[PDB]
RNA sequence: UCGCACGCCCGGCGGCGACGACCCAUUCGAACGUCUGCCCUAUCAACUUUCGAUGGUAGUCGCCGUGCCUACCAUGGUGACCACGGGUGACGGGGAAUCAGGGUUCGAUUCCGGAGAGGGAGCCUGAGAAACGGCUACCACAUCCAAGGAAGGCAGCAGGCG
RNA sequence: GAAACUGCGAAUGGCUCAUUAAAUCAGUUAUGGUUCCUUUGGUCGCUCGUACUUGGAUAACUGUGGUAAUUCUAGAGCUAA
RNA sequence: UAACUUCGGGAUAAGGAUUGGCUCUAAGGGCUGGCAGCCGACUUAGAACUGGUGCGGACCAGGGGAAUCCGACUGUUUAAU
């Protein structure tokens, strides 16, 4: 179920070998008033890179933007739009920039369009440097 | 790398219209009027009385 | 570049130290110590540019080498020995003491004081620290080190520190109320009565703080430097008391003060 | 030589970077250490801002930790019987953080018998040996044996590891860098985890 | 090719001119902190066993 | 380990320094990262990937984070909101000239930051160098020579040829 | 008090603009993901185990030399931290 | 992997590298009662070691390129020049 790699995966700070005659699992609010998901709590995953369940601390700035692709595993990528003024013509001008980000699967219910909490992290790999803290659905798609 | 200024300045301007005749001559009276030595003189004086008025005009919009 | 760099052109230097621009293309870089580079005021600076005891980079050598300075209690050999706030000035042959205060611009004044005013300095406390152990530890801002402290002392405290034994004497609480001085940034030498405490998470706090005539200003609070209890400092404050005088009445007592004197 | 730096290779867009300085010194990289078993070897490398480190070259012996009783004690190494990286890792003897490993159950075991007074393995018994386990024993301290026999199981697992007179490791330090080969003894789960694996690697 | 002799225990030391080579076929073909018996070097030279440490070459 | 003094007890104790040391703070930094920002070109429309491209897991190496590299996996990543490719008589910036209000052009040039020492590459010592008024090769050029060998790096200050 | 061993510095400064187009750089932030000579402040009988001071080399120096030639060096004799 | 092109070709274009022995590793399936047991058959990829650099070791087994003339091509023809 867990266990489909070739080491034993396990969370570095519990010790699961207590002599006995539920496993207790690491967990952390990260701070910033942002609320642990329950699921990071009862859940059974385990994940380096979970700011909720892993070594990575929350600094940096807090951004948002919008889900776009969810073809990569436990990371996806969204999308940021803003828009740059022009001093001459005295307009703006839309840009977007999108970037990679780490999805922990404690947020479980993902699809693409909604609005995301990333918070700056360590970097976590070659391009990836944000981790999502919260998920806000999308207009109407509820049901 | 050396300590010196490098700061200067015009104190004049010529005009951009080199030939006329009313112009010429308006200036021709201040020089003699005043005993200068050349139009320079008459030019470097027109060139810090436009500054007060540039400095007042811009504080007199504020 | 390939290392750290040792040379400090003027043009570059910090603009509270008054240098100027056709004496030198080189201005003395601050030694390493226990004050940063640009908050200091190197020993070359106050003997030869504010106090003019010698005229030369030589002759403030031959002051400082004779072992007549004493900065905070303690000689001092080096010309370019970075002092910086709080610090006391001790010259001893001639009866003289000092303690580097802004005035109410940006720039280190002179400001003669008691000897015993002099034997005793304030600072504020930067860490909480648990030594080896068990043993408590704080840093103070000019990086002295002191064990076994007053349980009570907090991380932005100030403290009253006696130059001969760098005990504590007793210690201000970070608190509304209490006086303060800016210590960086725009507001640096105004002196007022801290107001409000704001606190960012993750950013940096800033202080509201109003001076004593009602003028109200904020700042970061890495700038705050608590110097009292209520209104009364507890060191001797310069002329002008930290109370920035805006450029319209400045020089109208600048004047004022020149038809009175003829 | 080896660098371990960025400019040399694509942009996330997958265009080519070309360079705009030389390799630095800070950059660099130096040889594995590729730490086998054997007679004890270790070379020491000045590294950056004067420090040291140990490159372990050959290493024979290492202290484990026994989680569940929470001895720690000097052991030999024997085998190395898995790796998650590289098979090719294990062909060859070499150690690297968290491959598998044979040690020795004789330290554990002396420890267990004088703690508990219970023979663990064995399947004769040495003078020595039966002694400790039959000494003459007040009766004051004889009760303090004997509440220490209700913990005094062990998990099943580990006892057919303790008659057969070694044990399964796990290596937690990083040999080729700290010059150690220290670790922890495997039990619970991921023992099971790791016992599934090497028998059917074997096949 | 000159020889330069040198005697530690009294210290003294000095340079000797040979050219001949039938007196130093005994050195050749000898590695240096050898122990060569210098018989062969002329009529004072008996009994004596010199250590080869080592010279210049024709170049220097 | 070293220097000034030079005393007090009944041989033993003594003050002030100098130097050096493991560690923690401090200072000066340095190095990796975050966000936003750059000229022309479509007669450059698709680009990157088992010769790492984008991610996962375990490690190696590194002062540390990280495809930095290795093994096993997944098929990802960027683009008309201009990717990728090319050109630049392109070191970037604080700034300079011209100017009603807008703008246009310049910034090799004394301050900050980068890079480089004829072209590449590799290292020693050192806290800090991939150093060149340090070393080792190869390429080009070039100096002295007994012809065996030795020695070299002005985009430092002058000065010389072109 | 020359010389030599030892320690430190020589990674700053000075020159130039060939390379370099999200690269450099600028403003803004992080190192809770690291090194840091030196300066300042702390620590420096916390350890349960010939000291009234231990060892042998090596420069500088004396002396014998090589090479057409270098800030080239060899063999011998001493003696320090 | 080019010119050219009737867009089908040219094309094995042209031009390079590898190839032995031995010891291993991984992947690729059936039958019975996401597991377990019992059976298998040939292949592909990768690695270490190793030989006087030797390996498609005999046999088998395209020289190539740039052009001109003619006939589009496949096919047929003077059994005995
Ligand atoms: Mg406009
Ligand atoms: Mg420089
Ligand atoms: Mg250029
Ligand atoms: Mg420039
Ligand atoms: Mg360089
Ligand atoms: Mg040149
Ligand atoms: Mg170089
Ligand atoms: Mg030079
Ligand atoms: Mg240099
Ligand atoms: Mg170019
Ligand atoms: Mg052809
Ligand atoms: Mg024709
Ligand atoms: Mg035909
Ligand atoms: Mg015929």
Redesign the pocket.
Known sequence: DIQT???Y?KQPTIFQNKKRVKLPRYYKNIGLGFKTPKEAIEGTYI???CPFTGN??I???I?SGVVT?M?????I?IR???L?YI??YNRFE???????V?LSPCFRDVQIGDIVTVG??????????FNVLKVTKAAGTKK | ??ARS?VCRKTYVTPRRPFEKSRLDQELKLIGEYGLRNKREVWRVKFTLAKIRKAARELLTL | ???????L?R??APKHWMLDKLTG?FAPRP????????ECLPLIIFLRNRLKYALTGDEVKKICMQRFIKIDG?VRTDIT?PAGFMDVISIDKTGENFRLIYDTKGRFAVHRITPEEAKYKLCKV??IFVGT?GIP?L?THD?????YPDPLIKVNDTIQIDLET?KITDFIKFDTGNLCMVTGGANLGRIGVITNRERHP??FDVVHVKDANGNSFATRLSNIFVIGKGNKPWISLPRGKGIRLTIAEERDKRLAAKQSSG | ??????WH??????????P???????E???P??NTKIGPRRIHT???????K?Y?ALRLDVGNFSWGSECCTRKTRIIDVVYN?????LV?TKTL???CIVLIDSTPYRQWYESHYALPLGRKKLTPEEEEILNKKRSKKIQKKYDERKKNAKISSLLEEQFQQGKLLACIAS????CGRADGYVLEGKELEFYL?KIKA?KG | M?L?I?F?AT?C???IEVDDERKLRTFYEKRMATEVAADALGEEWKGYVVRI????????
């Open positions: 790699e070739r080491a995966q994940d380096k890179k990575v601390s600094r940096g700035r951004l692709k073809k990569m595993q436990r990371t990528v940021r739009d803003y740059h001093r001459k839309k840009r977007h920039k999108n970037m990679s780490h700056e992290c360590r970097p976590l790999s070659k391009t990836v440097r | 790398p050396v490098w | 570049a390939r290392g750290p760099k040792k040379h052109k043009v570059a293309v030694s390493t110590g226990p004050h940063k580079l640009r303690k020995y930067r860490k152990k530890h840093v990086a002295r080190t002191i064990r760098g993750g950013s | 030589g080896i660098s371990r730096d960025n290779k694509r942009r996330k867009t997958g265009g080519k970077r070309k705009y300085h030389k390799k630095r010194k800070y660099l990289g130096r594995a250490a490398v000045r590294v950056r801002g004067g420090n480190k490159r998650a990286s590289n098979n090719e062909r690297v953080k968290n990083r040999p080729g860098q599934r690697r | 000159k330069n040198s530690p210290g030391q000095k340079l440490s080592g010279g210049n070459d024709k170049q220097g």
